[PDB]
Design a protein around this motif. Structure first.
Motif, PDB file in Angstrom:
ATOM      1  N   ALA A 135       0.927  -2.388   2.107  1.00  0.00           N
ATOM      2  CA  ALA A 135       1.375  -1.666   3.317  1.00  0.00           C
ATOM      3  C   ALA A 135       0.455  -0.467   3.562  1.00  0.00           C
ATOM      4  CB  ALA A 135       2.815  -1.260   3.152  1.00  0.00           C
ATOM      5  N   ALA A 136       0.038   0.199   2.480  1.00  0.00           N
ATOM      6  CA  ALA A 136      -0.899   1.344   2.567  1.00  0.00           C
ATOM      7  C   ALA A 136      -2.298   0.882   2.998  1.00  0.00           C
ATOM      8  CB  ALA A 136      -0.897   2.071   1.235  1.00  0.00           C
ATOM      9  N   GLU A 137      -2.844  -0.132   2.318  1.00  0.00           N
ATOM     10  CA  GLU A 137      -4.198  -0.681   2.645  1.00  0.00           C
ATOM     11  C   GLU A 137      -4.240  -1.110   4.110  1.00  0.00           C
ATOM     12  OE1 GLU A 137      -5.012  -3.915   0.013  1.00  0.00           O
ATOM     13  OE2 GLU A 137      -7.012  -4.385   0.903  1.00  0.00           O
ATOM     14  N   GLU A 138      -3.176  -1.727   4.613  1.00  0.00           N
ATOM     15  CA  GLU A 138      -3.194  -2.265   5.990  1.00  0.00           C
ATOM     16  C   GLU A 138      -2.639  -1.294   7.023  1.00  0.00           C
ATOM     17  OE1 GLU A 138      -4.847  -4.656   7.089  1.00  0.00           O
ATOM     18  OE2 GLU A 138      -5.412  -5.875   5.326  1.00  0.00           O
ATOM     19  N   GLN A 139      -2.180  -0.118   6.589  1.00  0.00           N
ATOM     20  CA  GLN A 139      -1.621   0.930   7.458  1.00  0.00           C
ATOM     21  C   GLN A 139      -0.484   0.323   8.279  1.00  0.00           C
ATOM     22  OE1 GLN A 139      -4.782   3.804   8.865  1.00  0.00           O
ATOM     23  NE2 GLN A 139      -5.844   1.885   8.884  1.00  0.00           N
ATOM     24  N   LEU A 140       0.516  -0.249   7.616  1.00  0.00           N
ATOM     25  CA  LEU A 140       1.671  -0.832   8.304  1.00  0.00           C
ATOM     26  C   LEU A 140       2.689   0.282   8.624  1.00  0.00           C
ATOM     27  CD1 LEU A 140       2.163  -4.066   6.143  1.00  0.00           C
ATOM     28  CD2 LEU A 140       0.621  -3.668   8.119  1.00  0.00           C
ATOM     29  N   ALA A 141       3.717  -0.042   9.420  1.00  0.00           N
ATOM     30  CA  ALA A 141       4.790   0.859   9.886  1.00  0.00           C
ATOM     31  C   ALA A 141       5.792   1.066   8.763  1.00  0.00           C
ATOM     32  CB  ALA A 141       5.437   0.260  11.111  1.00  0.00           C
ATOM     33  N   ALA A 142       6.042   0.044   7.948  1.00  0.00           N
ATOM     34  CA  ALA A 142       7.114   0.164   6.920  1.00  0.00           C
ATOM     35  C   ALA A 142       7.014  -0.958   5.912  1.00  0.00           C
ATOM     36  CB  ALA A 142       8.461   0.119   7.597  1.00  0.00           C
ATOM     37  N   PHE A 143       7.642  -0.731   4.766  1.00  0.00           N
ATOM     38  CA  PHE A 143       7.728  -1.686   3.638  1.00  0.00           C
ATOM     39  C   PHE A 143       9.139  -1.650   3.093  1.00  0.00           C
ATOM     40  CE2 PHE A 143       7.427  -2.357  -1.001  1.00  0.00           C
ATOM     41  CZ  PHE A 143       7.278  -3.734  -0.945  1.00  0.00           C
ATOM     42  N   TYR A 144       9.688  -2.821   2.815  1.00  0.00           N
ATOM     43  CA  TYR A 144      11.032  -2.967   2.208  1.00  0.00           C
ATOM     44  C   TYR A 144      11.018  -4.132   1.225  1.00  0.00           C
ATOM     45  CZ  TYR A 144      12.224  -0.574   6.583  1.00  0.00           C
ATOM     46  OH  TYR A 144      12.236   0.205   7.726  1.00  0.00           O
ATOM     47  N   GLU A 145      11.888  -4.054   0.218  1.00  0.00           N
ATOM     48  CA  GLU A 145      12.330  -5.255  -0.515  1.00  0.00           C
ATOM     49  C   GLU A 145      13.736  -5.578  -0.026  1.00  0.00           C
ATOM     50  OE1 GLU A 145      11.767  -4.905  -4.693  1.00  0.00           O
ATOM     51  OE2 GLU A 145       9.601  -5.344  -4.517  1.00  0.00           O
TER      52      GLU A 145
END
Ligand SMILES: Nc1nc2c(ncn2[C@@H]2O[C@H](COP(=O)(O)OP(=O)(O)O)[C@@H](O)[C@H]2O)c(=O)[nH]1
Ligand SMILES: [Mg+2]
Length: 165
Positions: A135-145
């Motif tokens: 998520a950091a490498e791709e600069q995404l909006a959010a990450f969840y499990e």
């Protein structure tokens, strides 16, 4: 209701269909044939400001051919890129789907990464930090499990989207 097209993406078997169906219908179905899930699902939610109609697009199993149509991606406001926490290969392929999504949809798209099947703790192959790093490498909006099966953290993924729309 204002409407937002949200697309499900990720490798076969990750839980795309089960996430969409948990959010929209609050149901869970086991071992469904990949081609039979509804292609189009919806739910209208009261957010801050407004009634928002989520128009959720699902793949109808076509990701088995490792590509999806331009049209699938076009006009999406948001995308959920799903992997399976029990399948390290599924997280590697999540990055491929993020590049395809960026080739085909608007640069302004809100892109969320979801590690599904966290209920399968014994079979886990990738860490929370594995997903966070992507998520950091791709600069995404959010990450969840999440767990579509146990309905753990699915609603929050979609409500947090509203905000950003
Ligand atoms: N244990 C568990 N199984 C899941 C979960 N989500 C989906 N599954 C199962 O994983 C398989 C693939 O789910 P599906 O939603 O069809 O994945 P898709 O191919 O990405 O649309 C199915 O047998 C589901 O029942 C979950 O959160 N936990
Ligand atoms: Mg599916």
């Amino acid at each position: 209701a204002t409407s937002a097209k949200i697309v499900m993406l990720g490798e076969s078997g990750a839980g795309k269909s089960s996430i969409a169906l948990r959010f929209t219908r609050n149901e869970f179905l086991a071992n469904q044939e990949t081609t039979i899930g509804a292609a189009f699902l919806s739910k209208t939610v009261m957010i801050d400001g407004r009634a928002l109609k989520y128009e959720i697009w699902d793949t109808a199993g076509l990701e088995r051919f490792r590509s999806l149509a331009p049209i699938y991606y076009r006009g999406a406001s948001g995308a959920l890129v799903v992997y399976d926490i029990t399948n390290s290969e599924s997280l590697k392929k999540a990055q491929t789907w993020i590049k395809e999504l960026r080739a085909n949809a608007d640069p302004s798209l809100i892109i969320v990464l979801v590690g599904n099947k966290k209920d399968l703790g014994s079979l886990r192959q990738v860490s929370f930090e594995d997903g966070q790093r992507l998520a950091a490498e791709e600069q995404l909006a959010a990450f969840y499990e999440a767990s579509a099966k146990d309905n753990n953290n699915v609603e929050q993924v979609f409500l947090d989207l509203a905000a950003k729309l």
